[PDB]
């Protein structure tokens, strides 16, 4: 009946979309940037080494002051560091030790974490009396928490291993909207600078652009061959980058709705775990399974440097809002600050 | 600069107070062994928990050694992402219903899952403790003409019980042959790529209560002993 006809309609729609994108593909980003002088050699060194975590580190998040940062580990601790003088401001023991993500509120009053418990927890760092305690638990996901980011002191967006993303109201602990359309597990999230949209990558090799208010999917991006592990907006909010298990990084444009450039090398055959941009968006930084981190020229696709100081898999990565330091976590339980 | 000195001193005092508690917790962390309990919906994974929402957790201690067993619940059947969280457990307990030899081909699915676990690049140092349930159900199925094993495995016909095997008294040769055939099925995956960095410890559990914890204890002891021997260039 109607079956085997909707498939045909989807086929013609996909062919039309591909034809439109091919027609809109005037040139390549390489040709226009082929006259740009190369960046050169980026040589960076470790300035700090933060010690005190027992098990491997999955996540970290910088603060907006570019001095404090939070990290999470499988030992069941959430440690808040002072990147200057390497002092531990706080250390939160978690009810569940299988944490996979953490977030730091832009105001500085809260942190969040979650993992294989299908719960997002919010911790009050500015309690009037006593110590840091848990304030709100967000329940409603049917799979593990993969990522979480604050919009403000009362709104947080989460992704889960149940193929959905959600938006929550912290005061009442209910889902404002639910974002659906992915077929694989959602692994990474990134908020736009305007805080009006966010992108996500899932275990289906596709990335989606979402609208927080309407709760709808606006664009879908393909081009990767395996699971997408990390995602990050360009500084101006018109582009983003992804890293997948096919040992490749790609740059996608929101307006052009197609991939612009590919960052790969023949020697690299391991997956990419984390990705981040520089302050000006000229340098792209990625963490791999070969224990190193590569510094890519985002405009010319050639590698410019390496941060090789970790003895195990690099799990997380981060650049300050100020832009004067990079922190790198690893499965060897060490946080390194590079400059 | 006086206020700066005061705040720096307060920062250092808080740092040392935190380091004291971290040192206290390190001792508790290093004296505990973490297990991953894995299986299927009906293969078992329940009575083992009975012996003692996104993840369950069970605590038990034998001979003043603490064990933490982590039962995965409310997770999708796609395991290739959250399985990486258990690379540093002492052992993985793989639970299989050996009676279901008649999707409905549960044994082949369990074999493929075991092969994927064994050959994963992040679990290459993790040992597996293999439990085979429903031996009574397997014996009842084999005795009757309900089904056959040759339909799904055309090699049980050319298989005979090994001499070194130790069947329990009053057990038919056919059911023992089937049990050891399944055990050798798993052992042929396990022995192909071990290289000494991890091993498999198969056991036949039928209705034993509180013996399974003793078997897990002994297998973990053997696992850690072999790691220590291998790290001292003695094995």
């Amino acid at each position, epitope marked *: 009946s109607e079956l085997d006809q909707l*498939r045909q309609e989807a086929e013609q729609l*996909k062919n039309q979309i591909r034809d439109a994108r091919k027609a809109c593909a005037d040139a390549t980003l390489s040709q226009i940037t082929n006259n740009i002088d190369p960046v050169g050699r980026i040589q960076m060194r470790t300035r700090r080494t933060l010690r005190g975590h027992l098990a491997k580190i999955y996540a970290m998040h910088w603060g907006t002051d570019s001095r404090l940062l939070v990290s999470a580990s499988q030992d069941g601790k959430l440690i808040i560091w002072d990147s200057y003088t390497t002092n531990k401001v706080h250390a939160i023991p978690l009810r569940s030790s299988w944490v996979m993500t953490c977030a730091y509120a832009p105001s500085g009053n809260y942190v969040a974490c979650g993992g294989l418990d299908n719960i997002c927890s919010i911790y009050n760092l500015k309690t009037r009396e006593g110590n840091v305690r848990v304030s709100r638990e967000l329940a409603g996901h049917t799979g593990y928490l993969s990522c979480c980011r604050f919009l403000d002191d009362n709104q947080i967006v989460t992704s889960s291993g149940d193929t959905t993303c959600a938006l929550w109201d912290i005061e009442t602990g209910q889902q404002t909207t639910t974002f659906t359309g992915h*077929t*694989g597990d959602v692994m990474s999230l990134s908020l736009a600078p305007d805080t009006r949209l966010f992108v996500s990558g899932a*275990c*289906d*090799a596709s990335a989606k652009l979402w609208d927080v208010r309407e709760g709808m999917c606006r664009q879908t991006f*393909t*081009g990767h*061959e*395996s*699971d997408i592990n990390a995602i990050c907006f360009f500084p101006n909010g018109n582009a983003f980058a992804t890293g997948s*298990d*096919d040992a490749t990084c790609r740059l996608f444009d929101l307006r052009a709705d197609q991939e612009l450039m590919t960052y790969s090398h023949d020697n690299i*055959i391991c*997956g990419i775990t984390s990705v981040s941009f520089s302050k000006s968006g000229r340098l792209l930084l990625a963490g791999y399974d070969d224990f190193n981190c590569n510094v890519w020229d985002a405009l010319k696709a050639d590698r410019a440097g390496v941060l090789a100081g970790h003895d195990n898999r690099v799990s997380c990565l981060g650049v300050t809002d100020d832009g004067m330091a990079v922190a790198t976590g690893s499965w060897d339980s060490f946080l390194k600050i590079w400059n | 600069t006086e206020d700066q000195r005061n705040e720096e001193k307060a920062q250092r005092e808080a740092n040392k107070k935190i380091e004291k508690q971290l040192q206290k917790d390190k001792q508790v962390y290093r004296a505990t062994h973490r297990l991953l309990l894995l299986g299927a919906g009906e293969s078992g994974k329940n009575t083992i928990v009975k012996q003692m929402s996104g993840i369950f957790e069970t605590k038990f201690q034998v001979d003043k050694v603490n064990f933490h067993m982590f039962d995965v619940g409310a997770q*999708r*059947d*796609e*395991r*290739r992402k959250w*399985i990486q969280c258990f690379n540093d457990v002492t052992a993985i307990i793989f639970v299989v219903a050996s009676s279901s030899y008649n*999707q*409905t*081909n549960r044994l*082949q*699915a369990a074999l*493929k899952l075991f*092969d*994927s*676990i064994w*050959n*994963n*690049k992040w679990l290459r140092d993790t040992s597996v403790i293999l439990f085979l349930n429903k031996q009574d159900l397997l014996a009842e199925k084999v005795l009757a003409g309900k089904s056959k094993i*040759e*339909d*799904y*495995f*055309p*090699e049980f016909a050319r298989y005979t019980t090994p001499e070194d095997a130790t069947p329990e008294p009053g057990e038919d040769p056919r059911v023992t042959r089937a049990k050891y055939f399944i055990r050798d099925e798993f052992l042929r995956i396990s022995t192909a790529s071990g290289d000494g960095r991890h091993y498999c410890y198969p056991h036949f559990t039928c209705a034993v209560d509180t013996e399974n914890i003793r078997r897990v204890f002994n297998d973990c002891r053997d696992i850690i002993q072999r790691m220590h021997l291998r790290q001292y260039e003695l094995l």
Partner: nanobody, 128 residues
């Protein structure tokens, strides 16, 4: 985008033969392991066969070894399944699945209820 489209199949008398085909696009074929999966009516997905990146290593379920044959052509990005002899309990839909990641010896979720790297499937039935 990754596309797996199965061809071949249909209605065949018992004891007959068929040759299923699966054309792949959107990825480097040679770097991945490939499988064959099927779903009988009233049953779940079960694995049938698999082949390595080059073809040296091949496996079958016990019910199809000696009769079915799996081959791959990396030059033309096609996966084959020669179904030499058929039985009435071979009526199902056949899907060509792909390994989640390249350069790996393990295939985790190729038989789950939902999986992003599987094909549409072709109905194969034998009745009389």
């Amino acid at each position: 985008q990754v596309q797996l489209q199965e061809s071949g199949g249909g209605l065949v008398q018992p004891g007959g033969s068929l040759r299923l085909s699966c054309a792949a696009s959107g990825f480097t074929f040679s770097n991945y392991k490939m499988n064959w999966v099927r779903q009988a009516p009233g049953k779940g997905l079960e694995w049938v066969s698999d082949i390595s990146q080059s073809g040296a290593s091949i496996s079958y379920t016990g019910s199809v070894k000696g009769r079915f044959t799996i081959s791959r052509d990396n030059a033309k990005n096609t996966l084959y399944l020669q179904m030499n002899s058929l039985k009435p309990e071979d009526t199902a839909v056949y899907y060509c699945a792909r390994c989640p990641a390249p350069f790996t010896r393990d295939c985790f979720d190729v038989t789950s209820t939902t999986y992003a790297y599987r094909g549409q499937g072709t109905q194969v039935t034998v009745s009389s």
